Amino acid sequence: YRYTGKLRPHYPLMPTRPVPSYIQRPDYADHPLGMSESEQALKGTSQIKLLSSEDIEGMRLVCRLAREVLDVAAGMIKPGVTTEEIDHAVHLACIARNCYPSPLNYYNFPKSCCTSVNEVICHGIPDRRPLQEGDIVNVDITLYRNGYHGDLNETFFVGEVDDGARKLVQTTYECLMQAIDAVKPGVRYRELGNIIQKHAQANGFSVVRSYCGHGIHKLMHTAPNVPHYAKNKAVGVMKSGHVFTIEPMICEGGWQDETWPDGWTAVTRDGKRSAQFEHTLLVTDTGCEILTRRLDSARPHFMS
């Protein structure tokens, strides 16, 4: 394999971390290939669940717990700390909140969160590489509690970073918040990508095409599919009671991605940096509720 940039995987990984049997497990947890029967059954379906009131309480709960776990990870970001150390902490923090770490064994993903450094777009595997001053790193947290998944992510600076990194991370966050601002009943899911790409393009960045935002509730990834790029073909109209993510990935260079031999790590084909933010959203009668919002600050961690 020809790597696209400077980053390399740092193996071996520590043995897979056990989740005590008292934690309730999603279906794929114990599938040999990590397939989710429940996801697949609804795979290809266009129909969007309307959450009930107990569904909404369940989503509120797991999304706030996910946020707490992301906040634990945010506090560990500094030069010299390995992404595997961050995942260890994340794994324990999930267990402490009586949650299963959703990524763990999801289609055989081997860790409890995704860590995506520099040219890694998304789904990076926590490993033995120490974070380097200058890096940008995304941590993506997904928790499962009482049948519901909650999903968020932020990009972080590792010590001092350069102007290009400041600008890419800020712009990515602005892309996300502009899209969120547009969310309310009657808006087409396909419109969000027009908004995201307009802002990215204005700032000289490109928009990843192969990964999308998604419905989420009892299933981690379900209808709707939500592209982040302009003139997409996404199907569906927003309605009060829909829950879904928006998680744009924006890049310094070109939009094209490819996958490492690990089957998960998505990287820019050109080796230039990519940043991402993600919230889980509930559409309400007036707009939407950011279920994974940071409660104890107005702002994401990079703005500290």
Ligand X SMILES: CCC[C@@H](C)[C@H](N)P(=O)(O)O
Q: How many CA atoms lie within 13 A of 64 on its CB side?
A: 8
| Contact assessment for residue 275 and residue 137, using Cβ atoms and an 8 Å cutoff | no
* d(C-alpha 294, C-alpha 282), whole Å: 15
Which lies closer to ligand X via its Cβ, residue 167 or residue 209?
209
- Give min distance, CB of 123 to ligand X, in A: 5
3-class secondary-structure state, position 212: coil
Contact stretch for K ion (CB under 5 A) within 116-124, 194-202, 204-212, 230-238: 116-124
Q: Which does 106 bind (CB under 5 to 8 A by kind): ligand X, K ion, Co ion, none?
A: ligand X
* d(C-alpha 233, C-alpha 256), whole Å: 19
Return the H-helix or E-strand segment holding 205.
Answer: none
Q: What is the DSSP string of 16-53?
A: PPP--TTS---GGGGSTT---HHHHHTTT--------H
- Give min distance, CB of 257 to K ion, in A: 11
Contact stretch for Co ion (CB under 5 A) within 183-191, 227-235, 236-244, 245-253: 245-253
CA 221 and chain centroid, separation = 11
Instruction: List gaps in the chain by the residue before each (C–N > 2.5 Å).
Output: none
- Crossing angle of helices 191-202 and 163-181, in 10° steps, is 150
Q: Does residue 171 touch K ion according to CB under 5 A? A: no
Q: Does residue 135 touch Co ion according to CB under 5 A? A: no
| Contact assessment for residue 266 and residue 210, using Cβ atoms and an 8 Å cutoff | yes
Q: Does residue 245 touch Co ion according to CB under 5 A? A: yes
Consult the annotation and say whether 31 binds a ligand.
Answer: no
Which lies closer to ligand X via its Cβ, residue 142 or residue 171?
142
Consult the annotation and say whether 135 binds a ligand.
Answer: no
Q: How many CA atoms lie within 13 A of 52 on its CB side?
A: 4
Consult the annotation and say whether 140 binds a ligand.
Answer: yes
String marking each residue 262-301 x if it binds Co ion according to CB under 5 A: ----------------x-----------------------
Footprint on this chain of ligand X (rule: CB under 6 A): 103, 106, 109, 114, 122-123, 140, 142, 151, 220-221, 247, 278
Q: Which does 116 bind (CB under 5 to 8 A by kind): ligand X, Co ion, K ion, none?
A: K ion
Where is the binding site for a protein, in residues? Answer: 123, 221
Q: Can you give the binding site for K ion, defined by CB under 5 A?
A: 116, 120, 274
